[PDB]
């Protein structure tokens, strides 16, 4: 029974070790995601949460009729 069907205890042990390492890495990455989202929404100087402003290319740089501007 142990030879034909059941897996070795070392195989299950190291498979469990790899699974635990992968899930611990995923949990740490999720916590880092929450922290970075909070910090960079609060500061607003990151690639995300960048609400758009007016583009500066639409300003006319030519002189006007009245120079007091």
């Amino acid at each position: 029974i142990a030879r034909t069907f059941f897996d070795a205890p070392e195989k299950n042990y190291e498979r469990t070790m790899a699974i635990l390492q992968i899930e611990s890495e995923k949990a740490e990455l999720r916590l880092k995601e929450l922290e970075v989202r909070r910090l960079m929404r609060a500061k607003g100087d990151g690639p995300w949460f960048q609400y758009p402003t007016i583009d500066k290319a639409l300003i006319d740089h030519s002189p006007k009729a009245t120079p007091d501007n």
Binding site: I22, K26, L29, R30, D45, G46, P47, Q50
Partner: protein, 57 residues
């Protein structure tokens, strides 16, 4: 002996030789804010999938 100008002579743009210096700050503007940094580096693949509570792909 003053010549009356023709049509279009007074409507053209001329050049001036002026001895005043060019003002570097005509609008009296302060320093602009520092721009946010851009993205750099190769687009690496996803780390351990989507991580949506059970998904590894």
């Amino acid at each position: 002996g003053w010549v009356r100008p023709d049509l279009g002579e007074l409507s053209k743009v001329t050049k001036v030789k002026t001895d005043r210096p060019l003002p570097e700050n005509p609008y009296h503007s302060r320093a602009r804010p520092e721009p946010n940094p851009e993205v750099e580096g190769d687009l690496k693949p996803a780390r351990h999938g989507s991580r949506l509570f059970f998904w590894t792909m």
